[PDB]
RNA sequence: AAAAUGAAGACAUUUUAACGAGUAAGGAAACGAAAUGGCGUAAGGACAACAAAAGUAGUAAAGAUUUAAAGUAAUUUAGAU
RNA sequence: AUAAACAUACUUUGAAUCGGCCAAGUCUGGUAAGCAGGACUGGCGAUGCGGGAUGAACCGAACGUCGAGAUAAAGUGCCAAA
RNA sequence: CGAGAAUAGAAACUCUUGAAGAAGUAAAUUAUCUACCCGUCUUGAAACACGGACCAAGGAGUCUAACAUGGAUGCGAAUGA
C-alpha cells in the first residue's frame, strides 16, 4: 500500500444544473460550451453559478440593481437568480439579465424603459461579457441562519427554536 | 471477425453453507456475521463476488456466437435490428406460439437475421415425418 | 490524584530563583510596552495580586492593549481539538520583553542599510549592491587543500582496558 | 463491577484527524476591552473622517 | 511551420555538449588537485557530497507519528520508493530520524542517468506522466531553463540553482526489489544490515533495483 | 575483512586544526571502517562528525600475499564478568585473513560476537615467539604429518551423485 | 480527478493519471458528462405490429422439474418434459 | 529547508460509540500473578495474507480479478520449495 | 572516421490439427495443495457459552400528528386559501 493522507472522494462542486428542468439543462450546456471554447472567466463564473442549489442562488431586488448600477449607465446587470421587486422604491432605467423575473418586477423594469433579458440573449449579445455587472444576492439574510449553533453560548448565541413554553 | 471473449471466473459464487443446509439456497448473499469465516476472507474460504471479476466492456453480454441477444415477439420486432444483423441475433420469446414462430423464422431468413431459437416448438416431424 | 486548586503543583514553578528573592529590577517597571510587541509571561510569585494562571507561564504572547497599570497580552491556548485566543491583562511585574525576533530585526536592519545605499548609488549611476544572502542550513563543505608544512599525525587506536579500582 | 477509570489512549490520534483548528485573523483584531481613551480617540477621528467624506458626496 | 522541430534539436545538442563540459571540468579539477597534493606532500580534502538518494525500505504499518510526517515530507510514501534529497544540516538530521525506515547514500552520475531514463516521470496537471520526449520536458520545466532530459540529469546531479523546482516536478521513482541486506533490514548497514546510510555503496543496491 | 587507512581532523575551538588522526581499521567495507574510526575519535578525543571532516579513506593491501607470517593480535573483549585483554597468535599470509581468523575463533571459543571485540594492535612475531600449544607444532622446519581418513575429493558439483555404485572407501590420501 | 467532445451514437462517451482491506455506521429518488450503480415481489396509470385489426396466448398461459446461455452479483434469458 | 490545488477553510444535518484488551530498552500497589491501575506510541478489536509446527495482539507486510519477474520476515537432510 | 542537412533504396511468411468433433465450458471420479459451526453477546468462540433435528408457508422501523434541516418545484413582499 501507499501512505496517503486521504483517499479519493467526490469533489463537492456541482458541475451541472440540478433537477430535471429542460431549459436550465440547456443553459448549462450553452455556457459549458462557451466556458470551454472562449476560455473566458466570465462564462466559467456563470456556468458555476448555474449549478448552485436554489438556496445558494438568492434573489436580488430591483433596489439592489438600482443602487449597484447608478455609476454604470450603459451597462447590463447579470444576476443568476430570480429578480424580485422592491415596491418601496422606484425603478430606474437599466438592462437586467436573470433566470427569472417577478411579474411585478418585469412590469416595473419595462415601464421605466429598461429591458428584462434572459441568459440566451446575453450570451448571444455579450458572450464573453463586455458591458456586464455581475451581482449575487445576500446569503446571510436567511432566517434559518439565526438558529445555527448553541443558544447558551456567550459570544454568538443561536435563536432558540420556538416550541413548548417559549417565553 | 470475432474478438476473444475472456471470462475471469467461470464458476458460480455459491452462497456460504449452501452445500450443507437445504434451507439455504445457492443464490449469493453477503455473510454479515461477526465471526463469519468467509467475510473475513480466511484461507480456503476467500471467494466473494467483487467488481474485479467484471468482464471486459468490449465483450460484455456477448453470446458465444459473437452477437447480442435481441428478444423478439412478432415479425415487426425483426425490423428493429435488420440494419444491425452483424451485431444482434434474434431470440423468440418463450410464450410465442409455434405458428407465429414460423413467420419470425421465415422473415428472419429474408432479412438475414440470425435466430437462436430456430429449432424450438417444431412439430411432430422428427421420426417417420 | 492531584487536587483542582488554582495553584496546584507549584512548589517548584512558583519558587523564586536561588539568591533571587525580594524586590525585582526597576527595568521591569520602566520598560515601555507598545501594541504589537512580543512579551514573555513569567508568573512572579512574589506579587500575589494579579498573578497570571500557571498554564500561561513561559508562553510568548503579543501586546494588544496598554492600560495605566496592566499590559494586555494575547496568547494561543490549546483546547480539545482547536486553538483559542486568550486575552489577559497582566501587570509589568509578570511579563518580560521577548527576544524571539532579535535575529530577525537585525536582518531587517541589514537589508535596509543596503537599500539605503542603493537609492543613492542609483543617483550617481554606479552599480547597486545586492541584498544579503538568505540563511541556509549548514551546507556541505567544499574541497580544501591542507599544507603539509605544519602538520602532525597522532595515531588513534582502541585502548587497552585498565581496571578503575 | 469495577471499571477502568481513565485513559488518554487514542486521544492524540483523535485530536489530529481534523487537526488543531487555528483561530482566524479576525480573532486577533478584536477591540473589546481596549483602553478607554484610545477608543475615545479612535472614535473621534473616525467620526471626523466619515463626516468629511459625506460632505464631499453631497458636493458632488 | 515544423522548422521549430529542427532548431529545437540543435539546441538540445548544444546544451548536452555544454552539460558534459561542466561535469568533465569539475572531475578535471578534482583529479588535478589530488595529483598536485601528492607532489608537495600535502593533504587534499574531498568535497562533501551534495546529493542524496533515499529508498524507503519498510512498509506503512506501525510507524510513529513523527516518522510518518517526515517520510511524507521526503515523498517516501511507499516501500521501494526513491527520491533525490539535497544534503544540508536540515535534511541530514531529517534523514537520521527516519533511519530505520529508509536506506540512502550518494548517487553517481550513472545512477542518476539510469534512474531518470528508466523510472523518470513528471507531475503534469496532477498526472504522473512518464518521460517520453523532450517536448514534454520543455512544457513543464522550460521556464527553469531546462528543455531536455540532459539538463534534467545535469541539474539534479550538480544540484543547480533550480533543484527545488526541478526535483519537485520529478515524481518519486518506483523501483523493483533486490536483496536488501546481509543479515536483515532490522539493523544498520554498518552492523551488516539494510537500513541507514550506505554512502557510495547505495549504487550497488540501486543497480539491482532499477 | 579489509584494511583502510583513514585520516581526519577537527575544526573547532577545542582542537587545533593541525592535529591529524590516523588509524588502520579492519572492516568488511569502507562505510563500516569510517564508522569504527568515528567511534574512536568520539570516545577518545571528543571529536564528532559534525565538527570534523574526513581527509583520506583508502584500502591497504598486503605487500606480499605469498609469504607465511606469524601474526600476533592484541585485543580486548567484553564478557559477563568484565573486560579482558587477550593475546592470540595466528598463521596466515595476509593481515586481513588473520583478523578474519581471530573473529571466527573468538566467536567459537569465547562465544563472543563481533560487536564486543576491539582490535588494539596486530604485529608480526618471530618463529619462536609462538606460544599457542597447537600452533607451535607447525612452526618448525620439519613439520610432517600423514593426513588419514580422507574423504575422496569430488572435482566439481557435476559429479556429485546421490547414490553411487559399489562400495565406498576412505583414502590414506 | 483533469482535459476533449457532446442531441442521442452507447457499453453511463474519449484520453491520461492516481487509487481499491474493513466491524458499528453513512451514502432516499431525480439531476449529459448525471451529488454511488443496480436485481427481485405485488397492485395502480400509461405505453407495446403506425398504412383502418396494433404485446403474447388451445399451433398451448401461469406454475413445477431439469439443461444451457448472459451477468462480478442480486438475477435474467431460452430449450425439453 | 522540505512538502502541500482532487491544497486549504469550512457550514449544516445526522449515525454509531464512550464494558475495551495487548506489546514494551516505562511507572505505581502487591511476594507475585495470564493481578489492579496509569504516561507516550504502535496494534488487536474492525484484519485477511507470508513466517514463528499450533496461537486476537510477535515478525514481514495490509487485500479489485490475473500473468511474468525481482524480493520481505525467515529458511535450504526428509516431511517441505531451496 | 564522421552528427545535422540534402540525395536514393531494399517486409509482407510456412507447417500440424479440427463435424471421424478443434478451442472452451459444465458434470462425476481420482490425485497435489487447500478448508474448525453458523447466528449472537463479547476484550476475546471452533469452543466444555447460548439458539439451531428437517422442510414449506407466515414473520419484525409502519401509520397519524407537531417541529427542524436538506435536495427538486410554483409564486415572491407576499405565499396558501
From TrEMBL, chain B:
Source superkingdom: Eukaryota
GO cellular component: a single term: cytosolic large ribosomal subunit
SUPFAM superfamilies per UniProt: Ribosomal protein L32e
Keyword Ribonucleoprotein set for record: yes
Residues that span the membrane, as ranges: none
GO biological process: translation
The keyword Ribosomal protein is annotated on this UniProt entry: yes
Pfam families for this protein: Ribosomal_L32e
CDD domains: Ribosomal_L32_L32e (cd00513)
Keywords: Ribonucleoprotein, Ribosomal protein
Gene Ontology molecular function, alphabetical: structural constituent of ribosome
UniProt cross-references to InterPro entries, sorted A to Z: Ribosomal_eL32, Ribosomal_eL32_sf
Similarity comment: family membership: Belongs to the eukaryotic ribosomal protein eL32 family.
PANTHER family per UniProt: 60S RIBOSOMAL PROTEIN L32 AND DNA-DIRECTED RNA POLYMERASE II, SUBUNIT N (PTHR23413), RIBOSOMAL PROTEIN L32 (PTHR23413:SF1)
Protein name in the entry: 60S ribosomal protein L32, putative
The organism of origin for this protein: Entamoeba histolytica (strain ATCC 30459 / HM-1:IMSS / ABRM)
Lineage start: Eukaryota, Amoebozoa, Evosea, Archamoebae, Mastigamoebida
UniProtKB/TrEMBL annotation, chain D:
Ribonucleoprotein found in the keyword field: yes
Gene Ontology MF terms: structural constituent of ribosome
Biased composition (Basic residues): 11-24
The entry's keywords: Ribonucleoprotein, Ribosomal protein
GO biological processes: cytoplasmic translation
Superkingdom in the source lineage: Eukaryota
An annotated GO cellular component: cytosolic large ribosomal subunit
Listed Gene3D superfamilies: 6.10.140.1730
Family, similarity comment: Belongs to the eukaryotic ribosomal protein eL29 family.
This protein's name: 60S ribosomal protein L29
Taxonomic lineage of the native organism: Eukaryota, Amoebozoa, Evosea, Archamoebae, Mastigamoebida
UniProtKB/TrEMBL annotation, chain E:
Domain Large ribosomal subunit protein uL30-like ferredoxin-like fold: 55-102
Record key words, sorted: Ribonucleoprotein, Ribosomal protein
One Pfam short name: Ribosomal_L30
Domain of life assignment: Eukaryota
Gene3D superfamilies: Ribosomal protein L30, ferredoxin-like fold domain (3.30.1390.20)
GO BP of this protein: maturation of LSU-rRNA from tricistronic rRNA transcript (SSU-rRNA, 5.8S rRNA, LSU-rRNA)
GO cellular component, one term: cytosolic large ribosomal subunit
PROSITE patterns reported in the protein's UniProt record: RIBOSOMAL_L30
GO molecular function: RNA binding; structural constituent of ribosome
Family assignment from sequence similarity: Belongs to the universal ribosomal protein uL30 family.
Entry-linked PANTHER family: 60S RIBOSOMAL PROTEIN L7, LARGE RIBOSOMAL SUBUNIT PROTEIN UL30
Protein name as annotated: 60S ribosomal protein L7, putative
Organism from which the protein derives: Entamoeba histolytica (strain ATCC 30459 / HM-1:IMSS / ABRM)
From TrEMBL, chain F:
Keyword Ribonucleoprotein annotated: yes
Protein family (similarity comment): Belongs to the eukaryotic ribosomal protein eL20 family.
Gene Ontology terms: biological process: cytoplasmic translation
Keywords of this entry: Ribonucleoprotein, Ribosomal protein
Protein name per Swiss-Prot or TrEMBL: 60S ribosomal protein L18a
Pfam families in the record: Ribosomal_L18A (PF01775)
GO CC, alphabetical: cytosolic large ribosomal subunit
PANTHER family documented for this protein: 60S RIBOSOMAL PROTEIN L18A
A single GO molecular function term of this UniProt record: structural constituent of ribosome
Domain Large ribosomal subunit protein eL20 intervals: 1-122
Organism: Entamoeba histolytica (strain ATCC 30459 / HM-1:IMSS / ABRM)
InterPro entries on file: Ribosomal_eL20, Ribosomal_eL20_dom, Ribosomal_eL20_eukaryotes
Gene3D superfamilies assigned: 3.10.20.10
Amino acid at each position: 500500500a501507499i501512505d496517503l493522507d486521504r483517499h479519493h472522494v467526490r469533489k463537492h462542486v456541482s458541475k451541472t444544473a440540478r433537477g430535471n428542468n429542460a431549459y436550465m439543462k440547456l443553459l448549462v450546456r450553452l455556457y459549458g460550451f462557451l466556458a470551454r471554447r472562449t476560455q473566458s472567466k466570465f462564462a466559467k463564473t456563470i456556468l458555476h453559478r448555474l449549478c448552485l442549489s436554489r438556496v445558494n442562488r438568492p434573489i436580488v431586488s430591483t433596489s439592489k440593481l438600482a443602487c449597484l448600477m447608478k455609476k454604470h449607465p450603459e451597462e447590463t446587470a447579470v444576476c443568476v437568480n430570480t429578480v424580485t421587486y422592491d415596491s418601496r422604491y422606484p425603478v430606474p432605467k437599466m438592462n437586467v439579465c436573470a433566470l427569472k423575473f417577478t411579474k411585478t418586477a418585469e412590469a416595473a423594469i419595462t415601464k421605466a424603459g429598461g429591458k428584462c433579458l434572459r441568459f440566451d440573449e446575453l450570451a448571444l449579445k455579450a458572450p464573453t461579457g463586455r458591458k456586464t455587472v455581475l451581482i449575487r444576492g445576500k446569503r446571510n439574510v436567511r432566517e434559518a441562519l439565526k438558529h445555527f449553533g448553541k443558544v447558551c453560548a456567550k459570544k454568538n448565541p443561536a435563536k432558540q427554536y420556538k416550541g413548548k413554553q417559549t417565553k | 471477425i470475432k474478438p476473444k471473449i475472456v471470462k475471469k471466473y467461470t464458476g458460480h459464487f455459491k452462497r456460504f453453507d449452501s452445500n450443507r443446509f437445504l434451507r439455504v439456497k445457492a443464490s449469493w448473499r453477503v455473510p454479515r456475521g461477526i465471526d463469519n469465516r468467509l467475510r473475513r476472507k480466511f484461507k480456503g474460504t476467500n471467494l466473494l463476488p467483487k467488481i474485479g471479476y467484471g468482464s471486459a466492456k468490449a465483450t460484455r453480454n456477448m453470446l458465444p456466437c459473437g452477437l447480442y441477444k435481441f428478444p423478439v415477439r412478432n415479425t415487426t420486432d425483426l425490423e428493429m435490428i435488420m440494419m444491425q444483423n452483424r451485431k444482434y441475433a434474434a431470440e423468440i420469446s418463450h410464450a410465442v406460439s409455434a405458428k407465429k414462430r414460423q413467420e419470425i423464422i421465415q422473415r428472419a431468413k429474408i432479412l438475414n437475421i440470425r435466430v437462436l431459437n430456430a429449432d424450438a416448438r417444431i412439430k411432430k416431424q422428427e421420426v417417420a415425418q | 490524584p492531584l487536587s483542582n486548586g488554582r495553584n496546584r503543583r507549584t512548589r517548584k514553578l512558583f519558587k523564586r530563583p536561588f539568591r533571587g528573592h525580594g524586590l525585582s529590577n526597576t527595568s521591569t517597571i520602566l520598560h515601555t510596552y507598545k501594541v504589537g510587541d512580543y512579551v514573555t509571561i513569567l508568573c512572579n510569585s512574589s506579587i500575589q495580586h494579579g498573578l497570571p494562571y500557571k498554564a500561561f507561564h513561559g508562553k510568548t504572547g503579543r501586546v494588544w492593549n496598554v492600560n495605566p497599570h496592566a499590559i494586555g497580552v494575547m496568547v494561543n491556548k490549546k483546547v480539545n481539538n482547536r486553538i483559542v485566543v486568550k486575552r489577559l491583562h497582566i501587570s509589568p511585574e509578570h511579563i518580560k520583553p521577548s527576544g524571539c525576533q532579535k535575529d530577525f530585526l537585525e536582518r531587517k536592519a541589514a537589508v535596509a542599510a543596503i537599500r539605503k545605499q542603493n537609492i543613492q548609488l542609483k543617483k550617481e549611476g554606479k552599480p547597486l549592491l545586492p541584498l544579503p544572502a538568505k540563511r541556509l542550513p549548514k551546507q556541505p563543505r567544499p574541497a580544501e587543500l591542507i599544507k603539509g608544512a605544519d602538520i602532525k599525525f597522532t595515531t588513534v587506536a582502541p585502548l587497552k582496558f585498565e581496571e578503575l579500582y | 463491577s469495577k471499571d477502568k477509570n481513565r485513559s488518554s489512549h487514542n486521544q492524540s490520534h483523535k485530536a489530529h484527524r481534523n487537526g488543531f483548528y487555528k483561530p482566524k485573523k479576525s480573532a486577533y483584531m478584536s477591540t473589546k476591552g481596549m483602553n478607554v481613551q484610545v477608543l475615545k480617540n479612535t472614535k473621534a477621528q473616525r467620526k471626523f473622517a466619515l463626516a468629511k467624506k459625506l460632505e464631499a458626496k453631497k458636493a458632488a | 511551420c515544423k522548422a521549430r522541430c529542427q532548431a529545437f534539436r540543435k539546441e538540445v545538442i548544444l546544451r548536452t555538449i555544454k552539460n558534459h563540459k561542466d561535469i568533465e571540468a569539475a572531475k578535471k579539477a578534482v583529479y588535478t588537485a589530488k595529483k598536485n597534493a601528492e607532489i608537495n606532500g600535502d593533504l587534499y580534502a574531498e568535497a562533501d557530497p551534495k546529493l542524496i538518494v533515499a529508498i524507503r525500505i519498510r512498509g506503512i504499518n506501525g510507524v510513529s507519528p513523527k516518522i510518518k510526517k517526515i517520510l511524507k515530507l521526503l515523498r517516501l510514501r511507499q516501500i521501494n520508493n526513491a527520491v533525490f534529497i539535497k544534503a544540508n544540516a536540515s535534511t541530514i538530521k531529517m534523514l537520521r530520524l527516519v533511519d530505520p525506515y529508509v536506506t540512502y547514500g550518494y548517487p553517481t552520475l550513472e545512477t542518476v542517468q539510469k534512474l531518470i531514463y528508466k523510472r523518470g516521470a513528471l507531475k503534469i496537471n496532477g498526472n504522473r506522466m512518464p518521460i517520453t520526449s523532450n517536448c514534454m520536458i520543455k512544457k513543464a520545466l522550460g521556464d527553469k531553463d531546462v528543455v531536455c532530459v540532459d539538463d534534467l540529469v545535469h541539474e539534479i546531479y550538480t544540484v543547480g540553482k533550480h533543484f527545488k523546482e526541478v526535483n519537485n516536478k520529478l515524481a518519486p521513482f518506483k523501483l523493483n526489489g533486490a536483496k536488501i541486506a546481509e543479515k536483515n533490514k532490522k539493523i544498520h548497514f554498518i552492523l551488516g544490515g539494510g537500513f541507514g546510510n550506505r554512502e557510495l555503496l547505495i549504487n550497488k543496491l540501486l543497480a539491482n533495483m532499477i | 575483512m579489509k584494511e583502510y587507512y583513514i585520516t581526519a581532523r577537527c575544526t573547532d575551538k577545542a582542537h587545533n586544526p593541525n592535529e591529524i588522526f590516523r588509524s588502520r581499521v579492519f572492516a568488511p567495507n569502507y562505510v563500516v571502517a569510517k564508522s569504527k574510526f568515528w567511534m574512536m575519535l568520539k570516545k577518545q578525543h571528543k571529536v564528532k562528525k559534525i565538527n570534523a571532516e574526513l581527509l583520506q579513506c583508502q584500502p591497504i593491501f598486503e605487500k606480499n600475499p605469498t609469504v607465511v607470517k606469524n601474526y600476533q593480535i592484541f585485543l580486548r573483549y567484553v564478557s559477563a564478568g568484565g573486560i579482558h585483554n587477550i593475546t592470540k597468535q595466528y598463521r596466515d599470509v595476509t593481515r586481513v585473513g588473520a583478523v578474519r581468523q581471530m573473529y571466527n575463533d573468538l566467536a567459537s571459543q569465547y562465544r563472543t560476537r563481533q560487536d564486543k571485540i576491539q582490535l588494539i594492535s596486530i604485529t608480526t612475531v618471530g618463529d619462536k615467539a609462538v606460544k599457542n600449544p597447537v600452533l607451535h607444532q607447525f612452526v618448525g622446519h620439519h613439520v610432517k604429518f600423514p593426513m588419514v581418513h580422507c574423504k575422496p575429493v569430488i572435482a566439481s558439483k557435476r559429479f556429485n551423485l546421490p547414490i553411487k555404485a559399489g562400495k565406498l572407501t576412505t583414502k590414506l590420501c
